[PDB]
Amino acid sequence: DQICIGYHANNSTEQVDTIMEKNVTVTHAQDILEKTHNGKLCDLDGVKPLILRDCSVAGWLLGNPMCDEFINVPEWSYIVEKANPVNDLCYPGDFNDYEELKHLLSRINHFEKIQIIPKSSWSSHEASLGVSSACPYQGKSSFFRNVVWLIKKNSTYPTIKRSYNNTNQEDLLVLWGIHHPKDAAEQTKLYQNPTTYISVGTSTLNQRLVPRIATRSKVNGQSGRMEFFWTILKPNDAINFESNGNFIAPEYAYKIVKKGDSTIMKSELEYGNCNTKCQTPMGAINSSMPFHNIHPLTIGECPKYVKSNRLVLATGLRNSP
Amino acid sequence: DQICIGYHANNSTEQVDTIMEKNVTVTHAQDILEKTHNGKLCDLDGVKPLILRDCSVAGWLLGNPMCDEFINVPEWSYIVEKANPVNDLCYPGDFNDYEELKHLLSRINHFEKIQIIPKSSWSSHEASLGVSSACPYQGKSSFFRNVVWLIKKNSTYPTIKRSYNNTNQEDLLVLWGIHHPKDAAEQTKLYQNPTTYISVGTSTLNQRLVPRIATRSKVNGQSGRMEFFWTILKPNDAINFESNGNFIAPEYAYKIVKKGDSTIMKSELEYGNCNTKCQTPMGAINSSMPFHNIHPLTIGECPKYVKSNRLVLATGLRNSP
Amino acid sequence: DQICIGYHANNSTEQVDTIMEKNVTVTHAQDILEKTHNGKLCDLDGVKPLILRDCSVAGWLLGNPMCDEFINVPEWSYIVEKANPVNDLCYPGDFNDYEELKHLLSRINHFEKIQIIPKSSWSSHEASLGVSSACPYQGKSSFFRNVVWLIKKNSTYPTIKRSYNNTNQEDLLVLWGIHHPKDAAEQTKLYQNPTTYISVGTSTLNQRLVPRIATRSKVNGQSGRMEFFWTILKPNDAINFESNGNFIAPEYAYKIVKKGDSTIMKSELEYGNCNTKCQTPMGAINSSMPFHNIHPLTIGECPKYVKSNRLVLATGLRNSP
Amino acid sequence: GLFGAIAGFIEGGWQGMVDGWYGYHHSNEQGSGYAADKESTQKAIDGVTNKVNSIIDKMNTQFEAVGREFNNLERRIENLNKKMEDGFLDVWTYNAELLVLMENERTLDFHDSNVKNLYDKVRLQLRDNAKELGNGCFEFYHKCDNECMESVRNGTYDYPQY
Amino acid sequence: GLFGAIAGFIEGGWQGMVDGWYGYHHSNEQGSGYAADKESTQKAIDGVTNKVNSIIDKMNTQFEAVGREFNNLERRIENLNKKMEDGFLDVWTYNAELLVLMENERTLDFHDSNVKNLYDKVRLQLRDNAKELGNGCFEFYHKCDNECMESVRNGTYDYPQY
Amino acid sequence: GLFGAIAGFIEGGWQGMVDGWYGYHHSNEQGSGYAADKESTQKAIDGVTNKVNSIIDKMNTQFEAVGREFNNLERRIENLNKKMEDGFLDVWTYNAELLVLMENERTLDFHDSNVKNLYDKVRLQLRDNAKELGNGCFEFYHKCDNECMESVRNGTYDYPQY
Numbered sequence A, B, C: 001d002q003i004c005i006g007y008h009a010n011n012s013t014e015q016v017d018t019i020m021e022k023n024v025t026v027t028h029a030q031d032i033l034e035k036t037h038n039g040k041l042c043d044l045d046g047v048k049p050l051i052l053r054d055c056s057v058a059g060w061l062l063g064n065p066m067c068d069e070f071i072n073v074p075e076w077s078y079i080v081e082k083a084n085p086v087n088d089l090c091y092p093g094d095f096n097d098y099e100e101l102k103h104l105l106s107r108i109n110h111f112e113k114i115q116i117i118p119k120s121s122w123s124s125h126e127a128s129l130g131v132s133s134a135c136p137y138q139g140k141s142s143f144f145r146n147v148v149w150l151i152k153k154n155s156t157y158p159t160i161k162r163s164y165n166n167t168n169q170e171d172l173l174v175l176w177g178i179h180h181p182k183d184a185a186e187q188t189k190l191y192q193n194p195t196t197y198i199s200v201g202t203s204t205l206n207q208r209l210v211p212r213i214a215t216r217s218k219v220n221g222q223s224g225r226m227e228f229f230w231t232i233l234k235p236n237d238a239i240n241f242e243s244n245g246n247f248i249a250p251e252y253a254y255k256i257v258k259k260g261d262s263t264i265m266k267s268e269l270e271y272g273n274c275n276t277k278c279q280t281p282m283g284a285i286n287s288s289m290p291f292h293n294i295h296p297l298t299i300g301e302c303p304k305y306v307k308s309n310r311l312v313l314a315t316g317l318r319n320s321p
Numbered sequence D, E, F: 001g002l003f004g005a006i007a008g009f010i011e012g013g014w015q016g017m018v019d020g021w022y023g024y025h026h027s028n029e030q031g032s033g034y035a036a037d038k039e040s041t042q043k044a045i046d047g048v049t050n051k052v053n054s055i056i057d058k059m060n061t062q063f064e065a066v067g068r069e070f071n072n073l074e075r076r077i078e079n080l081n082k083k084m085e086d087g088f089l090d091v092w093t094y095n096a097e098l099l100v101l102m103e104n105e106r107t108l109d110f111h112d113s114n115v116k117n118l119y120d121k122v123r124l125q126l127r128d129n130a131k132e133l134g135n136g137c138f139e140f141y142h143k144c145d146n147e148c149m150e151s152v153r154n155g156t157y158d159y160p161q162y
């Protein structure tokens, strides 16, 4: 008669690593790394992202004619932009402090577009001939819809002096611009005055722009350039413009109604018709694992990202052959 | 007859955590995390801090009339500044490269103020009418005490050409400024000349400022602005000024006599009448512990900061019920 | 009769540390930290570095007359520059975005210098009198060899309008400059025209420089200054210049033929006549150890840097006295 | 293993013991079979469970990367940003992999320890009333019926009775 | 514990042993009492002390945050700065908490080991001149007076004498 | 050590055992000598070797500093850069030093364990056919010639034969 002491074995082939030994077969194990995703861009907690498609943040905000899909976008959870969106600045130029603005957007979920300076109210200047073949719309020459390219009327560009007072409760994103012409002839052709400027002031802002002239290569068939600027006009503050010419005046500006958690996600993928609690640029995640290895840039309630191919903890004991 | 092997027990209720078990009662333990502070701003090793109170670094250095307390401050250990000091730039404007200067201060313990261009020596310009209601002192209009707001004399602003040679052994912090007027009328009213400038040169520096005019909102009842600039004039080097108007000339500059370890600490607290070897923005620390969890920004001989609520090491063994 | 169980001992004095005990003598150990270097700058995988000696990256690229050694340098593995090279900008001034360019170089192994605007082709301006005592060569006044200091011819500086089209396959580094004169007399003396400019354009670039005048201290016996600028001209793109005076025109520009892994290493050492697979600013490394403590900035196939004085793993067991 | 029981003096585990991690196998005239030791098994389940949760929880606060963009003349800070983000990922990847390796070793050893202690517990009861065979088993000098066997599993093996 | 002594085959500690961490309790016709084992106790004090100092010292060099300020159009680098400083705090907080957990486990096991080894030391002297009771105690076959007891604590227990 | 064998009940090692880490010393009328236990020795070599490679490999991906330069009015980001690079060096220096300390402790204990288990293996064969002396040695009741000794080292010691 005997009694023996022993331990459990089973048919398990699960393996774990240790410092001294690799591929130890154990009776039980627990995988803690999520390796799969659905490969789609999805609603985050039901709230759809803003998918800019072929438009950039600039094309969107300035109102590139090809970006009318985003004329009045609802609240978003996150933003998706391609690596090289084709519909950027239709008329070539620069966007001043573009990156600092994109960063500002990561703290914004919703814009409300409103009119601050009507197009009709330019009674001393020509406001409806500010177009170009570089910005086409249905076969015809158009322009950034949110700003007004003003030119001379009956051979006269009188000094502009306009003021807008932010009577809204919300911070306001104001956009404007300056046109850099090809040569001296074009300057007088569009604006008459050979030496012009744009002065912009607010509570804090103290700007004065002058158009720079130079021979330039033709981007989208244009030797002229547009340099765009922005500011955040706080409530009860007023913005003041003064100019001799080359002024790209604001028509519409965006109210900042909702501030919160957001991000601009770089991805070539389109909308998945889909919902998730955790999104990556490669696809969404539905997992209870504490770790994943899909992509480092995520948004939502996510596992922690690691570069591992494999993380498996032993729970049971060394399994017998 | 018998002999037994055993181990110590006592009345201890100290508990420690392990990977596999939490709240294990042990006979002896050692807490290694400092959790307490005295809640005061104190002398560091006997050397009192500079407590700016309601003044900012700008108000202090430029010589805001409300900041006379700091007209000639002694050596400091560290500097304390509120989050929103009310006595900043009394006359509205900007301070150029303000943050880079504040960073420079973290390597400075003592300034010595000296006069480089006397107020009396402006024999062709009016130097005693450079005041404003925006910078009041005892009910009367005053101005930043360390710079001189020069205006026309008998309807004339002749070209200024002044040079100062750093004959001191110490690096010298030089401050100056430019006035941005409301409109063309005010420009000629103060300085006569419609088109002016300020050119500043040193061994390295090559500056030329021009006043920018624009309609601006009224901060402290002023539509004009003051933009302030600085440089470090090295020994045996000379600074050269030239201007038509709008020049805010230096009177006093600061010698850098002592360079060492310092910091600008953001805090709403006042002086504690107190001494310590380790200071935080929330209060000082007197501890022999290797860790603390008070605040990450400290100065002096301090424990290492961690985010833990609790760090307790077992020394003894598992205590018996 | 008996049989005993025991373990190995030997004459080893190797020691290792543990958490609970330091300096435990063990029978066998393995050192894993490389502590030695050869103290020399060496070829990396046979490919010699560019050792600038007394020249800086600016002196080299602009073509400082004292830096003719580097008139046409072959492919390099890495670059070595002193902390304070004496042959920098011979004529005093600034190099615009100098650090961003040096960073660009860390991704470059080889330049090919080519002529884009011949010196002879300046038929309306004097191109062979653009020299200074600040840039001496064999006792005579010379100048940066890669740019042309143009001045008036027969008392006339007509407007320059030059264009170069990048027909090469490679990206092209283009350098140019602006002269800042001492006073109004010198301006008309060199260039006639009192108010001048330089306008530079490319596909992206939209520049317009104006010479700033001021009284300045004499560096290398000069009160005038040279401010230098650069851009990367992409293939099939054209650069356009226009100027009234003060233009320092390009003659030679550098093709970027090889892009790869490189670095600018700060060191006072000279060439060792030597070869290695891993280089530091203090000397090279030939080791199979996984760690070293020589210097953090390395290039090549290197061990990982740590701040330890000692890393020794136990392999054997506790050795007996 | 460090403790010498699992795949040591006990050569292999038991497919036939389904209801616990460690236990007993008895063999007498009435028959034979397996019985799990409840106490030591539940001890093991609590320790390993607490460990997993401790591991998961400690990795809770950890670096999260954010999107930042930079223009063509901001290459230095762009590189800084990239080196910063990668640096933290490498650190947390190292932490996670090393913790799993280290604690897996300790989990296997822990089980080995629990078996060794259960074996000693029984050895210390039986003393010289049984032959220690050297393989995990004890051969009795007296007959040990099922109640006798149960008293061994109990902790109640009445040594003076035999 | 891993070694099976503390709160294992020795059910509980002794309030009555005040002068050391581990030791002996004797019981005979002359009386009874506790005596600390000096050697094993001092060994334990040295190990634990070295450990604490090793822990403290390793955390000596560690990230110190510095104040840096940024204007309204330097949000990207301000965020970089913040993410950098927080990143290192989280890393060092993790290191400190994990080290305390891991080494606390090893400290408790170390004590368990020291008790087990002291018990075996005595078992190996007495051999078959005493009954191993199964609870930390040894019942002698011969009378063991105070000098007899002392020789057990000595290491000098003269086995052939009994 | 945790397992009590090395510099414990076995007072010291053997200069005379050259061909392995652990083994046997025999002593009878025919003579005496050392013999290494092949199996347990090779086990130890595999574990320690795997450990070293595991250590080396885990430190493979680790922070590499790059040169970045900044002008006189970029002091804030220069400081950021420096604090970033130093921060990671301190972290990886800590990781490396702590890993070496922790694993050195485990390597010494591992050897101690291997000796203890080899000792128990032999004890469990001999049982009551030899006196356990208390110092690593077993004194036989019967004569044990070289073939007898070999069977102990074998695992084949025929207990019923004696």
Ligand SMILES: *[C@@H]1O[C@H](CO)[C@@H](O[C@@H]2O[C@H](CO)[C@@H](O[C@H]3O[C@H](CO[C@H]4O[C@H](CO)[C@@H](O)[C@H](O)[C@@H]4O)[C@@H](O)[C@H](O[C@@H]4O[C@H](CO)[C@@H](O)[C@H](O)[C@@H]4O)[C@@H]3O)[C@H](O)[C@H]2NC(C)=O)[C@H](O)[C@H]1NC(C)=O
Binding pocket: A165, A166, A167, A236, A237, A238, B217, B218
């Ligand atoms: C952009 O436009 C907005 C409005 O369209 C400007 O804000 C307003 O600015 C005016 C001055 O131009 C101020 O007028 C007077 O209003 C307050 C009213 O008092 C309180 O109660 C009402 C309740 O309806 C509330 O709206 C106010 O916020 C306030 O709490 C007057 O008390 C005050 O008049 C004073 O009289 C005192 C003697 O009785 C004098 O000592 C004072 O010197 C003063 O004259 C004031 O002048 C509005 O207060 C103000 N409203 C708001 C909501 O801000 C805004 O300034 C403009 N921006 C720019 C940049 O121009």
Ligand SMILES: *[C@@H]1O[C@H](CO)[C@@H](O[C@@H]2O[C@H](CO)[C@@H](O[C@H]3O[C@H](CO[C@H]4O[C@H](CO)[C@@H](O)[C@H](O)[C@@H]4O)[C@@H](O)[C@H](O[C@@H]4O[C@H](CO)[C@@H](O)[C@H](O)[C@@H]4O)[C@@H]3O)[C@H](O)[C@H]2NC(C)=O)[C@H](O)[C@H]1NC(C)=O
Binding pocket: B165, B166, B167, B236, B237, B238, C217, C218
């Ligand atoms: C701001 O002001 C300071 C002084 O107020 C300027 O520094 C001085 O600049 C002058 C030139 O304007 C130099 O003058 C001459 O002084 C040296 C003296 O020699 C040595 O010994 C004295 C001991 O007292 C010491 O002070 C000096 O530092 C120096 O080591 C002369 O040797 C030298 O004259 C030379 O004569 C040689 C033939 O004998 C010639 O070959 C040379 O070409 C040269 O003419 C020199 O010219 C001072 O040296 C200088 N002092 C100091 C302390 O710097 C400073 O330049 C000014 N800044 C600006 C931006 O203008």
Ligand SMILES: *[C@@H]1O[C@H](CO)[C@@H](O[C@@H]2O[C@H](CO)[C@@H](O[C@H]3O[C@H](CO[C@H]4O[C@H](CO)[C@@H](O)[C@H](O)[C@@H]4O)[C@@H](O)[C@H](O[C@@H]4O[C@H](CO)[C@@H](O)[C@H](O)[C@@H]4O)[C@@H]3O)[C@H](O)[C@H]2NC(C)=O)[C@H](O)[C@H]1NC(C)=O
Binding pocket: A217, A218, C165, C166, C167, C236, C237, C238
């Ligand atoms: C700097 O200089 C270079 C050349 O020195 C400029 O690049 C060239 O620019 C010219 C326009 O000025 C273009 O001319 C015509 O060439 C293509 C040829 O077609 C293809 O096949 C050849 C094979 O040899 C290849 O070289 C080309 O790359 C191309 O793939 C013509 O097809 C085209 O002409 C068109 O005719 C169509 C009707 O047939 C019309 O609808 C079109 O509107 C168009 O007129 C074109 O115009 C060259 O293509 C171009 N070559 C290269 C290699 O880039 C460069 O533009 C200049 N830079 C600046 C900033 O000015």
Ligand SMILES: *[C@H]1O[C@H](CO)[C@@H](O[C@@H]2O[C@H](CO)[C@@H](O[C@@H]3O[C@H](CO)[C@@H](O)[C@H](O)[C@@H]3O)[C@H](O)[C@H]2NC(C)=O)[C@H](O)[C@H]1NC(C)=O
Binding pocket: D146, D147, D148, D150, D151, D154, D156
């Ligand atoms: C663990 O196991 C031992 C051995 O099985 C237990 O002892 C046995 O306990 C049973 C159930 O209580 C006893 O049965 C009872 O016997 C009495 C007297 O004959 C009778 O009046 C009851 O109706 C019932 O049948 C049994 O006698 C007893 N046997 C022996 C040999 O001791 C023990 O109780 C268990 N202890 C623990 C802590 O689990």
Ligand SMILES: *[C@H]1O[C@H](CO)[C@@H](O[C@@H]2O[C@H](CO)[C@@H](O[C@@H]3O[C@H](CO)[C@@H](O)[C@H](O)[C@@H]3O)[C@H](O)[C@H]2NC(C)=O)[C@H](O)[C@H]1NC(C)=O
Binding pocket: E146, E147, E148, E150, E151, E154, E156
């Ligand atoms: C550890 O303890 C044992 C047992 O107590 C020690 O043996 C005893 O040692 C004492 C003190 O040295 C001896 O006392 C002496 O006896 C002689 C002869 O009678 C006498 O001349 C002296 O004046 C003194 O009284 C005692 O005889 C002895 N007893 C026995 C039973 O051995 C032992 O020395 C200790 N060893 C160590 C390493 O601590």
Ligand SMILES: *[C@H]1O[C@H](CO)[C@@H](O[C@@H]2O[C@H](CO)[C@@H](O[C@@H]3O[C@H](CO)[C@@H](O)[C@H](O)[C@@H]3O)[C@H](O)[C@H]2NC(C)=O)[C@H](O)[C@H]1NC(C)=O
Binding pocket: F146, F147, F148, F150, F151, F154, F156
């Ligand atoms: C481990 O060692 C034991 C003891 O040395 C081994 O047993 C011995 O094995 C040898 C070699 O096989 C035997 O020798 C042979 O004996 C037979 C019969 O006399 C003879 O015909 C052969 O020519 C040869 O001499 C020897 O008898 C035997 N001795 C004893 C006492 O058992 C055993 O085989 C070894 N086992 C292992 C697993 O290594």
Ligand SMILES: CC(=O)N[C@H]1[C@H]([C@H](O)[C@H](O)CO)O[C@@](OC[C@H]2O[C@@H](O)[C@H](O)[C@@H](O)[C@H]2O)(C(=O)O)C[C@@H]1O
Binding pocket: A129, A130, A131, A132, A133, A134, A141, A149, A151, A180, A181, A182, A186, A190, A221, A222, A223, A224, A225
């Ligand atoms: C408001 C206005 O003046 N619109 C013009 C525009 C501007 O004058 C010009 O872009 C400013 O630099 O120019 C437009 O013509 C230029 C255009 O002409 C085409 O024939 C040619 O194919 C193009 O390469 C280009 O030169 C324009 O379309 O942009 C006309 C517009 O009405």
Ligand SMILES: CC(=O)N[C@H]1[C@H]([C@H](O)[C@H](O)CO)O[C@@](OC[C@H]2O[C@@H](O)[C@H](O)[C@@H](O)[C@H]2O)(C(=O)O)C[C@@H]1O
Binding pocket: B129, B130, B131, B132, B133, B134, B141, B149, B151, B180, B181, B182, B186, B190, B221, B222, B223, B224, B225
């Ligand atoms: C040196 C000088 O000219 N000081 C004036 C000052 C400046 O002309 C002006 O600030 C430059 O922009 O203006 C002062 O008057 C302006 C002031 O007038 C008050 O009546 C009113 O309450 C204010 O809103 C403001 O318009 C000034 O005090 O700043 C007078 C000063 O002497």
Ligand SMILES: CC(=O)N[C@H]1[C@H]([C@H](O)[C@H](O)CO)O[C@@](OC[C@H]2O[C@@H](O)[C@H](O)[C@@H](O)[C@H]2O)(C(=O)O)C[C@@H]1O
Binding pocket: C129, C130, C131, C132, C133, C134, C141, C149, C151, C180, C181, C182, C186, C190, C221, C222, C223, C224, C225
């Ligand atoms: C192209 C040209 O004009 N070269 C001049 C040069 C420039 O006019 C000047 O540097 C622009 O600011 O000036 C040179 O003379 C100046 C020089 O004169 C020496 O006598 C004196 O020793 C120096 O301090 C300095 O003033 C020059 O060498 O730079 C002559 C050159 O031909």
Ligand SMILES: *[C@@H]1O[C@H](CO)[C@@H](O[C@@H]2O[C@H](CO)[C@@H](O)[C@H](O)[C@H]2NC(C)=O)[C@H](O)[C@H]1NC(C)=O
Binding pocket: A022, A023
């Ligand atoms: C442990 O097992 C893993 C998983 O099977 C092994 O990984 C395989 O290795 C072989 C040979 O190197 C390759 O052909 C396979 O591609 C690997 N498979 C996977 C899924 O990664 C690993 O090599 C084993 N390690 C050791 C030390 O034995």
Ligand SMILES: *[C@@H]1O[C@H](CO)[C@@H](O[C@@H]2O[C@H](CO)[C@@H](O)[C@H](O)[C@H]2NC(C)=O)[C@H](O)[C@H]1NC(C)=O
Binding pocket: B022, B023
């Ligand atoms: C271990 O003990 C700590 C300290 O007592 C426990 O913390 C308390 O938890 C209870 C219930 O969650 C709360 O009501 C108290 O607020 C906590 N007190 C403190 C001081 O933190 C902890 O919950 C215990 N943990 C376990 C696993 O038993």
Ligand SMILES: *[C@@H]1O[C@H](CO)[C@@H](O[C@@H]2O[C@H](CO)[C@@H](O)[C@H](O)[C@H]2NC(C)=O)[C@H](O)[C@H]1NC(C)=O
Binding pocket: C022, C023
């Ligand atoms: C362990 O040994 C090292 C190496 O010998 C000791 O380091 C020496 O320490 C002494 C006294 O502090 C100094 O005089 C020497 O300069 C040190 N030598 C080296 C090479 O570093 C160390 O002190 C010992 N540590 C302990 C705890 O005993």
Ligand SMILES: *[C@@H]1O[C@H](CO)[C@@H](O)[C@H](O)[C@H]1NC(C)=O
Binding pocket: A011
């Ligand atoms: C392993 O055994 C389990 C019993 O728990 C059974 O469910 C499963 O089907 C078996 N798998 C294989 C591959 O035999």
Ligand SMILES: *[C@@H]1O[C@H](CO)[C@@H](O)[C@H](O)[C@H]1NC(C)=O
Binding pocket: A275, A276, A286, A287
């Ligand atoms: C996620 O996956 C689980 C399976 O584990 C599934 O039951 C659940 O419905 C999924 N949730 C969502 C939101 O897709």
Ligand SMILES: *[C@@H]1O[C@H](CO)[C@@H](O)[C@H](O)[C@H]1NC(C)=O
Binding pocket: B011
């Ligand atoms: C615990 O016992 C110690 C004796 O060391 C004594 O000083 C202390 O007062 C006791 N505390 C309690 C609460 O009983």
Ligand SMILES: *[C@@H]1O[C@H](CO)[C@@H](O)[C@H](O)[C@H]1NC(C)=O
Binding pocket: B275, B276, B286, B287
């Ligand atoms: C700090 O606290 C200790 C108590 O641990 C006290 O004795 C000492 O005086 C204090 N030191 C200072 C400078 O306050």
